Write an enzyme that holds these catalytic residues in place. Structure first.
Site, short mmCIF file in Angstrom:
data_model
loop_
_atom_site.label_atom_id
_atom_site.label_comp_id
_atom_site.label_asym_id
_atom_site.label_seq_id
_atom_site.Cartn_x
_atom_site.Cartn_y
_atom_site.Cartn_z
N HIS A 4 7.27 2.59 4.20
CA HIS A 4 7.03 3.74 3.33
C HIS A 4 6.73 5.01 4.12
CE1 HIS A 4 2.65 2.78 3.83
NE2 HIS A 4 2.51 4.08 3.62
N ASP A 64 7.13 -3.99 3.67
CA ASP A 64 6.81 -2.61 4.02
C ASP A 64 6.69 -2.46 5.53
OD1 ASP A 64 6.34 0.10 3.58
OD2 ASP A 64 4.18 -0.20 3.17
N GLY A 89 -2.91 8.40 6.04
CA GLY A 89 -2.26 8.68 7.31
C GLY A 89 -2.51 7.66 8.40
N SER A 129 -1.73 4.23 7.87
CA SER A 129 -0.80 3.13 7.74
C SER A 129 -0.03 2.97 9.05
CB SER A 129 0.17 3.36 6.58
OG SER A 129 1.01 4.47 6.79
C1 ZJJ Z 1 9.59 2.97 -0.40
O1 ZJJ Z 1 9.66 1.69 0.18
C2 ZJJ Z 1 8.48 0.94 0.10
C3 ZJJ Z 1 8.51 -0.58 0.30
C4 ZJJ Z 1 7.22 -1.39 0.22
C5 ZJJ Z 1 5.87 -0.67 -0.08
N1 ZJJ Z 1 4.61 -1.44 -0.16
C6 ZJJ Z 1 3.36 -0.78 -0.43
C7 ZJJ Z 1 2.06 -1.59 -0.52
C8 ZJJ Z 1 3.34 0.75 -0.64
O2 ZJJ Z 1 2.13 1.41 -0.91
C9 ZJJ Z 1 2.28 2.85 -0.95
C10 ZJJ Z 1 2.14 3.48 0.19
C11 ZJJ Z 1 0.71 3.02 0.60
C12 ZJJ Z 1 -0.19 3.82 1.32
O3 ZJJ Z 1 -0.53 4.90 0.96
N2 ZJJ Z 1 -0.74 3.23 2.54
C13 ZJJ Z 1 -1.79 3.87 3.39
C14 ZJJ Z 1 -1.37 5.18 4.06
O4 ZJJ Z 1 -2.12 5.76 4.77
N3 ZJJ Z 1 -0.04 5.73 3.90
S1 ZJJ Z 1 0.33 7.16 4.73
O5 ZJJ Z 1 0.16 7.00 6.16
O6 ZJJ Z 1 -0.62 8.23 4.37
C15 ZJJ Z 1 2.02 7.70 4.27
C16 ZJJ Z 1 2.38 7.93 2.80
C17 ZJJ Z 1 3.14 7.12 5.15
C18 ZJJ Z 1 2.74 8.60 5.28
C19 ZJJ Z 1 -3.04 3.35 4.09
C20 ZJJ Z 1 -3.18 4.11 2.77
C21 ZJJ Z 1 -4.31 5.16 2.73
C22 ZJJ Z 1 -4.60 5.81 1.60
C23 ZJJ Z 1 -3.79 5.54 0.32
C24 ZJJ Z 1 -4.52 6.06 -0.93
C25 ZJJ Z 1 -3.55 6.35 -2.10
C26 ZJJ Z 1 -2.44 5.24 -2.22
C27 ZJJ Z 1 -3.10 3.87 -2.63
C28 ZJJ Z 1 -2.06 2.74 -2.55
N4 ZJJ Z 1 -2.70 1.48 -2.88
C29 ZJJ Z 1 -1.89 0.27 -3.06
O7 ZJJ Z 1 -0.71 0.36 -3.23
O8 ZJJ Z 1 -2.54 -0.99 -3.06
C30 ZJJ Z 1 -1.82 -2.02 -3.55
C31 ZJJ Z 1 -1.04 -2.78 -2.49
C32 ZJJ Z 1 -1.73 -4.06 -2.91
F1 ZJJ Z 1 -2.34 -4.70 -1.88
F2 ZJJ Z 1 -0.93 -4.86 -3.68
C33 ZJJ Z 1 -2.69 -3.25 -3.76
C34 ZJJ Z 1 -1.50 2.67 -1.11
O9 ZJJ Z 1 -2.19 2.38 -0.18
N5 ZJJ Z 1 -0.04 2.95 -0.85
C35 ZJJ Z 1 0.89 3.35 -1.78
N6 ZJJ Z 1 4.58 1.49 -0.55
C36 ZJJ Z 1 5.85 0.81 -0.29
C37 ZJJ Z 1 7.16 1.65 -0.21
#
Ligand code: ZJJ
Ligand code: ZN
Length: 198
Positions: A76, A100, A156, A158
């Site tokens: 993602h 992911d 940020g 991940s």
């Molecule tokens: C498109 O193709 C694909 C394929 C498979 C995917 N698979 C997943 C699980 C996914 O999830 C997205 C992105 C991720 C995230 O934001 N990740 C962190 C992050 O920092 N990203 S990032 O660096 O800023 C950025 C966007 C890259 C630049 C660490 C989190 C920090 C804060 C998030 C707060 C708001 C969000 C809360 C949310 N919560 C949650 O979904 O929990 C449930 C998953 C569960 F366990 F089932 C419960 C969350 O975390 N996300 C939402 N997208 C996918 C996309």
């Protein structure tokens, strides 16, 4: 039109988390302007060091972690993008949207973490700000923050590592479990999923 179709740029290493000494701290190695240029060409001559890289696209920034010679990050953040390198864009070695997860060959100069074999449930999450957050493992892919925090502090990060007490890679940070904006638990890609993919 076909003649005007554009290309998405490469992921670019813009910094690293320094875990070498007694204190963890983030270092930036490239600014936004150079990052934009480097993403377009895919040519990155900067020297790479360490286990945890800070990476950016034109629109997002996150982390990447080297484990067993592969630089891993989240789909993602990176999508199917190439990563910039001294010889030009490098195609992903691994891509799994179901987990992911993506991976490239680890850049020359990086250091790789070794997968954890301790089976310990006392973990430590490394963020893009070089915070080391105690996390108690709660399942194959879940861990609870010992001290909850607003999700803003995890955004940020991940692609960063969950480590065991011995400094081994336990997983890759994937998502945050929050209620009312407070992060109580984390979802991560277990290192065994990586070792399986490899
Ligand atoms: C498109 O193709 C694909 C394929 C498979 C995917 N698979 C997943 C699980 C996914 O999830 C997205 C992105 C991720 C995230 O934001 N990740 C962190 C992050 O920092 N990203 S990032 O660096 O800023 C950025 C966007 C890259 C630049 C660490 C989190 C920090 C804060 C998030 C707060 C708001 C969000 C809360 C949310 N919560 C949650 O979904 O929990 C449930 C998953 C569960 F366990 F089932 C419960 C969350 O975390 N996300 C939402 N997208 C996918 C996309
Ligand atoms: Zn271990």
């Amino acid at each position: 039109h076909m003649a005007s179709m554009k290309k998405k740029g490469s992921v670019v290493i813009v910094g690293r988390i320094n875990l070498s000494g007694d204190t963890a701290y983030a270092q930036q190695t490239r600014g936004e302007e150079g990052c934009q240029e480097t993403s377009q060409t895919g040519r990155d001559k900067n020297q790479v060091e360490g286990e945890v890289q800070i990476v950016s696209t034109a629109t997002q920034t996150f982390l990447a972690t080297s484990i067993n010679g592969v630089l891993w990050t989240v789909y993602h953040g990176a999508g199917t993008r190439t990563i910039a390198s001294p010889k030009g864009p490098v195609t992903q070695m691994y891509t799994n949207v179901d987990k992911d997860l993506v991976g490239w060959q680890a850049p020359q100069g990086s250091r790789s973490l070794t997968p954890c074999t301790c089976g310990s449930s006392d973990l430590y999450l490394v963020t893009r700000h070089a915070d080391v957050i105690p996390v108690r493992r709660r399942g194959d892919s879940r861990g609870s923050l010992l001290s909850p925090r607003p999700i803003s502090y995890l955004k940020g990060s991940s692609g960063g590592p969950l480590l065991c007490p011995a400094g081994h890679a336990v997983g890759i940070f994937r998502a945050a479990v929050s209620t009312r904006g407070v992060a109580k638990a984390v979802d991560f890609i277990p290192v065994e999923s990586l070792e399986t993919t490899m």
